[PDB]
Amino acid sequence: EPTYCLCHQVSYGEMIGCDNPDCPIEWFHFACVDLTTKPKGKWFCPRCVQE
């Protein structure tokens, strides 16, 4: 039943992981982070980039 992302909903569809090991969210739904295809290289979520 765990929830993730900035939307705090259960996992579904394609999800991307934040590369900051101290990220409190860790996983996000592609659409919630405006992703259609997985990006190339490391990826950091909005929260960690603007921390």
Binding site: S11, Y12, G13, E14, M15, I16, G17, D19, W27, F30, K38, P39, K40, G41, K42, W43
Partner: peptide, 7 residues
């Protein structure tokens, strides 16, 4: 980037 498909 690391991604996964919800099972």
């Amino acid at each position: 980037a690391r991604t996964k498909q919800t099972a």
